[PDB]
Structures are given as C-alpha cells and as structure tokens.
Design a protein around this nucleic acid. Sequence first.
RNA 1: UUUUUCGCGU
Lengths: 1386, 59, 56, 61, 113
Amino acid sequence: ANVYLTDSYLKGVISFSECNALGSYIFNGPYLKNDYTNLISRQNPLIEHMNLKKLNITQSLISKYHKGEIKLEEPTYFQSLLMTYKSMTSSEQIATTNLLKKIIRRAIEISDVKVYAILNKLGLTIKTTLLKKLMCSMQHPPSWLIHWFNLYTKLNNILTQYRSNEVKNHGFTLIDNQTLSGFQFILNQYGCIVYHKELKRITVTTYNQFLTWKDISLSRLNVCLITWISNCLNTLNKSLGLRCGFNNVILTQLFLYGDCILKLFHNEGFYIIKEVEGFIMSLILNITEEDQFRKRFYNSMLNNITDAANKAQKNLLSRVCHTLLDKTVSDNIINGRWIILLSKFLKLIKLAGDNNLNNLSELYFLFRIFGHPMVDERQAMDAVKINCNETKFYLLSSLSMLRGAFIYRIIKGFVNNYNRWPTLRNAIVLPLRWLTYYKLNTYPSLLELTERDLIVLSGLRFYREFRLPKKVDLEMIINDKAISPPKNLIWTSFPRNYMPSHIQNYIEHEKLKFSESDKSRRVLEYYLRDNKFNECDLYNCVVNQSYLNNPNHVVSLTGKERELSVGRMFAMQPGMFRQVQILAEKMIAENILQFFPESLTRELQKILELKAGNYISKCSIITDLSKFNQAFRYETSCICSDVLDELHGVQSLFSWLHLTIPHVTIICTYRHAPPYIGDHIVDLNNVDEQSGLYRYHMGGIEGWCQKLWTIEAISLLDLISLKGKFSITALINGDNQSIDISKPIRLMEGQTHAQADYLLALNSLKLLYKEYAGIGHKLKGTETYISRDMQFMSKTIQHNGVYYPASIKKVLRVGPWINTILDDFKVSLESIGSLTQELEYRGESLLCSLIFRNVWLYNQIALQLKNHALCNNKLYLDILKVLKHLKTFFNLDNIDTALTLYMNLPMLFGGGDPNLLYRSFYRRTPDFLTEAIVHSVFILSYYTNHDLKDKLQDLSDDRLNKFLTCIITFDKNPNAEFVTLMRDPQALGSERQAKITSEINRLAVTEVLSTAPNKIFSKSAQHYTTTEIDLNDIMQNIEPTYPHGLRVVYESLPFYKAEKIVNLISGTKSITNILEKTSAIDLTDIDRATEMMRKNITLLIRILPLDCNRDKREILSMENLSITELSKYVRERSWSLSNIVGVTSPSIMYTMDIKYTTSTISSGIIIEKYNVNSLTRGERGPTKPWVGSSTQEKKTMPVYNRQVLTKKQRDQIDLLAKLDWVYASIDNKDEFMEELSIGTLGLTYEKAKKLFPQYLSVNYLHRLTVSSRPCEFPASIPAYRTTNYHFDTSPINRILTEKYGDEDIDIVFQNCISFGLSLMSVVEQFTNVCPNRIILIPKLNEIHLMKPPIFTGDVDIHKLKQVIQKQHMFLPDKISLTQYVELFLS
Amino acid sequence: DNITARLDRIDEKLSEILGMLHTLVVASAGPTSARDGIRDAMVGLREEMIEKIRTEALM
Amino acid sequence: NDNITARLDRIDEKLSEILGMLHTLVVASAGPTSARDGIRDAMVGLREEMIEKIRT
Amino acid sequence: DNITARLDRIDEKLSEILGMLHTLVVASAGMVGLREEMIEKIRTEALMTNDRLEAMARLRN
Amino acid sequence: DNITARLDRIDEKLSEILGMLHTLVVASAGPTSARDGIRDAMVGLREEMIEKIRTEALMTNDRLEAMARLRNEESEKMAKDTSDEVSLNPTSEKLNNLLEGNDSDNDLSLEDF
RNA sequence: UUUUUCGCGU
C-alpha cells in the first residue's frame, strides 16, 4: 500500500473556503460567510467532513452547541486563547523548566568545544571561562521563556502524535484533551475542532490552521530564546551578542496586544497587522530623515493604519451579519474603543524599538510572529476583477512616447552590446538627424534626447535579430508544480460531491475524449504521459500561433501561500499556454533583459552599495508594484512587446497575454470554492459569472510577463527623467522599486540644502503620478512614499553606509524537521545550520548563532529523533550505537561527552556539525575534505590538550593520531569513479562519504521513467545505466585525473540535461507513484529513505573502526605532517587513482598563523583597521567593500555575430573552448574535439574553432571557471564591515617568490583576506576591542606547487559516440548552415 | 537654403506622423483582431512564419 | 538640386506609408463582423499566392 | 515647374490624409479597394522579407 | 516666392494634422456594457471621448478623474495624494492624540478587549 | 476523500 505523511509546517494556504465548508456542515448553518460554499457543503458534504462529524465526541459537541451551552467563536479567538494559555499546571511547569534548563546546559556544553577551539586558534564539562560565566548567568530561564517553550512543546507533541498515528494507519483522527489543560483537540488532516470546556467555546479549523498555531508558538519561542541569549551575552560583553536588545517583557506584552487585536477584529485584523510596515518605517524615518519627510510619512502612516482598521471593521460587520458569527462581534467594535487598544499596541512597538536603528530594523519579525490570514479566494478574485475589467483611456501622444522610450532603450542596448544598430525596415521613417545616427552607429544621450525624438522613434520596425530555440528546453520546461486542466476539464479539480450530477456525467463522458497527458494536474505527469511528444512542438505552436483562440484555454486562481495580503492570487494554465508563457519570459530574460540593467533578477548588500554613492539635489521615491500588474492592457503593455516580437521575428509571442486572456474565463479553481453551475450548462464560457468566476479579464496576471512589465516600467521611468530634466538611478527589483532622482538646482535666498530636496521630491512625485496615470496606473499614497537618503529593498535597512539587518526574521522558524522531505535527518541538520548561520552572517554574533544552533541541534538529536514519524526508534538506536562507538574509540567517560563530540564532528565523516569552522571566517572554500579534516583536528584539540598557536606536534594522548590514522587508512572498493567525479568533483568514494538522496533515488527515478508513455524520457531512462558505464569509460585512460576537467566534459556532454532532470524528479515527495494518481508515499520509498538515514547515522562506525584497520599498530606520526598532503592522499586512496590534481587546496584557517604584533619575521598578511576607534561594529570605513571576487581569466572572444546564436549554443561553444584549453595536451585531442563538435553542434572542428574564445592563461588549474568551482570568496562579515579595514599581501608575495618562485600556487589569497577580516571581527567580538593590526603568517609546509600537468592518454571515441547517440534527445540546437553563414556578416 | 530647411521641417513632422500612426496601428490590433484573424494583416508578416511558409512550399 | 530631389523622393515615400497606415486603420475599424471574414480570406489567398510564387 | 507639381501632389496627398483620418475617427467613435491596397502592401513587405531570407539561403549554398 | 506660398499651406495643414493628433485620445478595448462580448479599442477626439465618459457610454471607475486627466488639470484627489502636507482623517487625529501624550484613560487590561 | 491543495519565480 502507501502511507500519507502530513507536513509539520504549514507551507501552504489557510483557506477560508475549507474552514467555511467544515463549519457549515458541522453546525448546519453559515459558519464564516454566505457564499455558495456553505450551501454546497450542507447539501452534499465531503466524505472527510462526514467522517469528522460522525465522531462520538464531535456529535456530543454539536448536541451541546445546539442546546446552547457553548458559544461558537472564531479560529483567531482560539489562537489568542492558546497564546495566552494562562492554564498551565505546576507539575508541567516545573517539568518544562527542567527540560529547558537541560537543553540550555547541553547546548552550552556542546558550544564549549567550538569556543575553545576558536580561542586556542586566536591566541586569546565546560573549559572556557567565558562560557562558564554564561552558564552561571543563564541558570534560571525567564517565565515568558518557560511559557512559550511549554506551549510549543505541547503543540509539537500533539502534532507528532497525530503524524505518527496517521503514518501507522490511514484515516486517523486524534482526540486529545490532556496534553493541553482545559483544551480539547480533534485534529485531523481535513479538519481541526478545538473546544474549551472552561469558557464554553468551540470552533472548527484546518490542519494548516493548527500548523500555523504551532508555528506561532515556535516563532515566539525562537524570538524569546534569541533575545535572551543576546542579552545574556551583552551582560558580560557588550560586543559579544546581537546588536539589538530587548528585555522581552515588552516583547511578550507586544505579542499579547497583537493577538488581542487579531481576536477583537477577527480575521480582518490582519489588515491592521500588515500596516505595521508603515509604523516601523515611520519610526526609522523619525531618526534618520529630516523634519518634513518624517512628518509627511508619519501622517501618511497614521492615515493608512486608520483606513485599514475602518475597512476591516466594515468588512467584518458586513460579512458576519447573516452567519453563525452574528453575536460574536466584540462590543468594542461598535463604540470604537479599539482605537485605545491600537494606540497601546503602537506605543508598545515604539517602546520596544527604543528609538534605536538596530532594534527597529530587527523588529520586522512581528509580521511572521502572528499567523496568516484565512485568505478568501472569491473576495480577492472580485477585487482583481473590478480592478482589471475597467476601460482605460490613453493619449496617443503618451503611448507613442512610451513606445519611443522603449525603442530608445533597445537601441542603446544594441549599440552598447553589439556596436551596431539593429536591422530595421523603416529606414525612411527616420529624419536626417536620426539617419545620421543610423549610418554612423551612435546614439544621443538623454540630455539631447527629447519628447520629439521619442515620438519619432515610435514608428520603427526591425527585422529578426534573435533566434527562437527550435528544440524545447526540458530543464526550463519540466517542474514539480501543478497545471490547470483544460477548459472542458476544469470541473475535474472540484470534488464530485460539490459538482452537480449533470456536471459529473459530462466530465465522465468528456474524460475519454481527452488524452492522458492533459488529463493530469501536475507538470511532471503532464509531460511524462505525453505519448505523442515532440521536441519541435513548442516552436511549431509559437510559430503557428496555436494558442490564439484555443477552445481549451482557462485561467485558474488560488490564494497565495503564507502571505499577509489576502489580495494575492496566483494563476495556472494548461500545459501549452504554460509553455508559451515560460518561453516568452525566458527569451525576455536572455535577450532583452540585458538591455535593462536596472532590473535585478540577479548579495543584497552589494546592490545597496551601488546606491551608497550650483547645488545638486538628490531624492528617493519608493513605489510598491503589487497591483501594478493589473493596470496593463494591450494598448499599453503590447505596444512595447511588439518590438520584442519583431526582434525575435515572431508574431504574438510576447503579446500572448492581452490576446488570449480576454477571451477566456477566470475561475477560482480551489477544492472548497466551487461555482454555482445551474442546469444544462457544461462549459465555462456559458456558466454565468458570479463571485466564483468572471470573464473578460482585460488586464495583466501577476507573475506572467513580469520581466516585460519591469522593462516597460524602466522605459517609463527613463521617459519621466527626460520630461522632468532630472537623472534617475531606478533599481526596480520585482515587486518593489527605488528611484534615485538627482537634479542640479540654483539655490534661492533663505533656502538651505534641506526643504529644497523636499521641493524636488514633491515635483518628481507629481510628475510620476501624472505619467503613471497617463500610462494607465492609478497608484495612491499608500504604495509610494518620499525619502531623501533611504536605501530600502527586500526588507533591508541601510543608511550612512551601515547595514542594519533583520536576521531574527529569517532564523525565526527553526525547528526539528525544517525544509526536509520524508523527514530527512541530514537535510534537517543542514537546514538548521544554514538558517542559524544567518545570525552570524548578518547580526554579527558568532557566539549567539553558535548557541542557538547548538540548542536546536541538541533538541533535534536527543529530543525528536525518538519521535520520528516514519521510523519509530531506529534512528535513535543508531545514534546510541554511534555514541557508544565514539566513547569506546576515544577516552570519553560519558555518553554525554560522546554526544558533544558527535555534535562537534563534521558531517562529512558521518558527524553532526553542519557548519564547519571555516564558515565562521570565509563562506566558500576550494575543497571540503581539507576543511573537514582541519575542523576535526581543531575539535579534537578540546579533549587532547594540543596547542593550535604553534605547529602541530605529537603528544602522549594520541586520540588525534588515531583519528587521522583511521581516516588515512581504509579498504579500497571503488566503482564508477570517473562518472562519480564528473558528477561531484569533490566526491570521496569507496564508502568514505555520506550518500545524498539523489544518489539512491537515481535508480528509482530511472526505473519509473523507463515505464513512461513519453518516448523521450522512456528512452533516456532505458539507456541510462549503459550511458553511465560509457561515461565512466570515456576518460579512464588519462594519467593525471582532473575532476574539474571531468566536470567540464560532463557539462558539455548531453547526459548533463538528462541527469539534471532525473535529479529534479528525485526530489519529489514520492517516486514510483508519479504515474499512479496518488499523493501518498510508497512503502518502497519509505524503506529506501529509512535505510539511507540509518546508513548515514551509522557512518562514524565505518569511518572510525575500533581496530584502525591497520593491525592495531602503525599509528601515523604527527610530527612534520601536512594536512593538505594527508587530504590529497586520502582522496587518491579512496578513488584508487595514482594522482588527482587541481582539487585540493590548503585550509586557510589552519595555514594562517595569527600574531597581533610585528617582528623581524613579519612576513604575513598585513591587515589593519583604519577607523580611529576601539569598536568598529556597525560603522562605515573609508575603504571599498571587499567583494572577494576571484581573478578573472583572460579570454579573446572572436569577432562574430552572437545574437543569431541561442544561449544554449553559446554555452556549448564556451564549454567546448574550455575543453580545448584544458585538454590541449592530449594524444587523442584532434579527433576527440572533432567528434565532440560534430555530435554536440552541427559544425566540424575547424568551423567551431572560429567561434572558440581562446584563453590566454597558461594555467588552467588556477583560472578555470567551472560551475563546481567558486567564483568569489566573500568573508563571513557583511560587505559594509569590510570597509573598515585595509589588507596587504606584499610580504606573502615576497616569501612565495623566495620559495616556489615564478610559479602558480594552489592557495587562494581572496580566502586569506576574507579570513583575516572575519578573524579580526571575531577577535573584537570576543575581546571588546579591535586590534590595531593582525598578521597572517603562512605555514609553508601545506603550501604546494600547482602547475598544469601534461595529460597522457586517449579519449575513448567509441564510448563518446555511444553517449552522444544514446542521449541524442537532450542535445542543444545544432548550428545549421543557414545559421553559420551569417555568423561573419558585417 | 530656406527651401531645404523648411523641407527638413516638413520631413520631421512627417516622421512625427509616422511614429504616431504606427503606434496607433500597434495599439489598435488588440484581442479583437486576434479572434477575427486580422492581427497578422494589421502587423504584417514575420520571419519565422514566412520561413514556415517557405518550407511548406518546398515540401 | 540633388538634395531637393532626394528630399522629395523620401517625402513621397513617407506620404505613401502614411496612406497605407490610414488604409489599414480604416479597414480594421470599419466593417463590423463583415469585413473580418473578407480580410481572413484575403490573408489565406495571400498565403496561397506566396506558396505558389515560392514553388515557381 | 516640377517642384511646383510635386508640392501640389503633396497637397492632394495631405488632403486625402485629412479626409481618411476624419472618416477613420468618425467610424471608430461615431472599402474593397482599400482592403486590396493594404493586402498588396502586406504582400510587398512579405516579399521583401522573403527576398532577404532567400538571399541568406543562396549565400548559404 | 510662388513655391514658398504653395508650401505655406502645406506647413499649415501639417501643423493642423499634428495638433489634432496631439488632441487625439484612445481608449482600451474592454468588455461591452452588456458583457456579452469584447469591444474594439474605441479611438477619437478628446472632447467626444470626454462626452462619452460623462454620458456613461464607456464605463469607468472614476469619471471625474478621467475628465481631470483628459483635460490636463490637477484633480483634488491627485492634489491630496501629492500635497506638501497630507491631512489627517478624524480616526487618525484621535490615534495621533492618543499616541502623543502620557496615558490618561488607563485601560491596561487585556481582558477588557 | 475526480491525485487533499500547492502559479511565475527569484
């Protein structure tokens, strides 16, 4: 059979319709609204709802409610009731306090090893006195912390019990009345009934509602824990914890007032909750901005909040009037005392901010602290309909101006890129002035450009310049998402019970009239079930305009997930229209988007430094573009898309939206929101339009053509700049845009620099409003606001050069099984580590992030592993076995010490530490094995009294020696070594490394795809294992193995696309069930995942045997040992390869010795601070930000036309050029490259050589640019902090010329600089004082010479041809003769 | 030179007229032309489907 | 001179293009639901003529 | 008087422009030969594009 | 001078063409009033289109704002949106009074609400 | 329980 595994986090929608239907069927009356949902649920209820109602306890509850003893209420009301629990007992209180004390103590003990290693390297149960003091400080947790932890543990216990029982047997309902005192829970997958006996109140909610309640509890627990840890750290060292600080009494009171507001205003209170953006921004502006801007923003924010509150009250009173919630409205609504409560909330928020930039920036977690609104899909659809199907009036001059601005942008991009005007038909339309610009390829600047020239340019027609790909790109087509069924099958989403009998009969008769592919609802199923598939099908459809007037076109709609704005609806389309839209967006991104650098789909800190810089007056306009999609029509959004259609030589590809959407029906496609069909109507085009569906959209759909709308907005902004005579540095990024307006002015008498920037701002805002009204946008004061020196994007605060982060917002939802599939253990640990790394990377607190990460790691290990849903106790038994093995291996005297060591061992060797020590100093490293070995040595320095200040030596305690021996000696049983190295250049192999889920799921995915209707995927899967063998055999005869060169070969060959698709499929919820129409998970999948997890847990046993696999003798001497040499030998021994080069690199953290004073041996990196102060955290320096970019390789691109070549062809050409550069010294190179070019492209080697960007760099081990090699090495600290220091490298270059002179070196200096910068940041964090300078002396023994080897061998052309022929359906478009002929035409 | 200058001014105004009329042509097609199958006539032939016609004629 | 002749030889072409644009606007705007079928027939006939010309 | 004749014919072209734009406006807000002329145009641009494509093909061959 | 006098009327008529094209306005091709089909993109002179908007021939959400936009005038709503000092509605006035000033009404009870 | 639902995306 198969099991249904529910999710532990909502990751979805708390649908209004499901709650309404459930309540209506339970209580025999309108629960939440008088929609069609309640009527249809009461008439024909769902099977799950009937099962939920037929429970013995549920029947008693309904009988009690009908007798009137208990009063019906709202899910938000019980959310508030649960949050203010006020019902805990003394026994559970003391138990929770003891558990929390144990968790804190264990987390500090675990972090002690990392802190001791860091302190030992820096030279500055628990061994560190700092953490001893921290433990003494955090002995008694605070009452709010115990309260939140108890609530979270109770909710998580309920959820885990329900999930385990549901996995055990399907269709289980959990009835709980003892886990939470005074609360009754009837939680189920399809419903959740909460009953409070003490207050005589009852509701029904959804599983998503219970999930979001648990997430509220977890989020508030995380906020309280993080703030408590930061405050405790700041108590003994003000520069040790997070920059922000709260007493958390204000925070608990703030949560209480927030959910009290939510309860008082019901589900409509999230309108008020969302507007807290305005209040936080106003509080920030009160500190930074000037008097006029701050006053204007404050007044606008007050108006917005009060308008939202009034609208919420009116909507609530209208909605709950003729329902079962008529008498549940609080008396405070009518008399208006809610204004006092809102004022208290705002004052308490301001007090929590405490007039501090750090606190106000960090406060942004309040948005996710409260739950998510129950989005009403029909109401949002009605709003977007009334906004869309409205006639808009455009002046023809305005449309011509916009089109001319777009044309000018296109011409500027073409000139700047290809050094030539595009081929245009209307050469006579231009006057002589523009004809001069056409003949001699230049463009006028904006200063000399004019409205007249924009009008003139609007009548230009171009020839084809960009080429549509003929073969469909499966990587960008295939996805795991869902698609809408055809128009004739739109009823197949809704349940049968809700649909009328005639609709059911019609859909049964019409199913057999549709193919199997379009009868599905998922992308993967749709493309796998296409027996009559064709690679040249999307291209043919686009060319023939098959999407136009297609009878089977429909646009679904569904509420956006985890969004506080209910008016966010996402739409779906059938497969063909989805293909068309995705293709249009893709071509806009590849070809047109690079003419518009202002659009960041591309580090937010970096982008924000871009914005960090008789009188020149500057300004800032920030506009929200949430509703900007719906203001577009064909007359506005397609006058510019016709330019793209002409450039691509295609008709109606970029204008498909406002040519097909108006003729179809926009319908709310949700399970619990069915429309009223009536009788004798079986199609959407004749179904009457109501709140459930409407026709004649006449507008844009969010998401689709987003890049087109952004480039049109950029063109409009350029036109606005031209018409206002001010420079604009707009930086539009998705749904929000920021405008930097600069205009030189002559200052008047009695006017300062201020109050003139305000005048410029007002004039520019008037111009912006007028021009957006002319183009057809009616933006109001709610979306846009005025500023002078604000750089705000993606909810980031930065001014005066200092970046104030919001790390608590994104580390907010950290728990046991986060961002995991099938409750994977290793993936959960990586997710926890990555999320907790945000604190260190943004809030500048290594120790706070370490403590939080260790808290949650210990919770996941020793608290939730025994409660795993799939495997009940096997994971915990394996963990106990591993801990016993570690205790036996080392001299540990306690299983607690064994657990600490396991938590502190790198997960590469089957450990438990997700974040190694290098991540604390530099983000990216050339190799992971060396860093893992260094981390293991540093951790083992905690138990063995070694000293990292000096060189590594040999002592009596040889636990480190035993570890380094067990990792250097092992049995060699390698297979598929070359293909494995091609897949992962850093793979170890021979069972010396953990297995990724894809590595085990590849066979299952291939087996599934073999029995698939799609011939392409079927053949690819059938010829997969043979392709693997051939790929392994291609380059097994090359003496010096280069993993990165093998990766280049892998990328060049067509097997890369097939295996990428296989890997994408491997990430699905359940393999072997895609083609079975079931959402459950197969027992085979469960067993495979369980076996993988058990093997991954029991990996330290194999890596560290209790006999050292060397006859209990011959332990490696520690004296004169190179970690780089040891790691290289381990890799070569694991792969059974004579020599592996170009993949190992010395660990910078281990190599760089640290001394804070200069001497006669000062031959290290010279890093010193330039700011004249003791503390430089949160301050800007005079130097440029340290991006850490790697050295650019030297290339000589040949002079030829590139627009006629597609992106895939250009990528293949670049990969082939890399192959020619790397493997030039190959005995078989000539015919190897000839056959590779003939297979991949339509050209021969001689023809392809003309397009190869020949590389001038002698060494390819230092300058190669594989996707598997890092392109930059940024520091752990953010960009702004690196500006406070200066770095030098001259002593290092002198010493590296004295030794290994005039030759390239394997070490990377960008990582060295980043390590030094983050090193001195950590030093000032731990010592409350920044050193004047730190010196990084290298240990020369790990330094190795890295030179280009001379490969000796022959590439197996037979196997190469076999791979090409087998994977012939994934090759890129061949460069035909008709395309090659124009490659060299000027 | 006066005749040439005013001829150039007339030419510039003619370019004005061409630009406005062409943007009117583009904006005047709309979804209404798509359902009537006249948008191809409104915006003319394009390279891709001309090549399709060519290969159909050869085939 | 030559400049005047060239300027007129561009101006008349511009006028011809303007007349063509006015022609297509008048054709598209007028003939409610009746001229559209004629335009479609003219388009399919033009496609047939292009096919015949390419074959020839 | 060739320049005078050219200016005159431009004058009738402009008068035709006024008449045609006025009738377009009154038709939109308030025939066979015109359709034939616009089809002949569409054909001549389709032939120019086909000429470019066949020139590319013959350069390929 | 004969050629100059002959092309003076050319220039005048061209200027008239451009002026009336500037005054020309175009509407969107939205649905018909009966909502039984789609409507062509109506195009015409500015005054006639304003007349149609006022007579509700072409339905729109904000008729007066349409008149203000087409007549090149600053509407009161636009002025309020881009005013130098934005006003406060009575609810925001009460909220501002409550925020600015120490607590006077007490009511520090979560159970009251 | 017409595959519980799960867009485009960054």
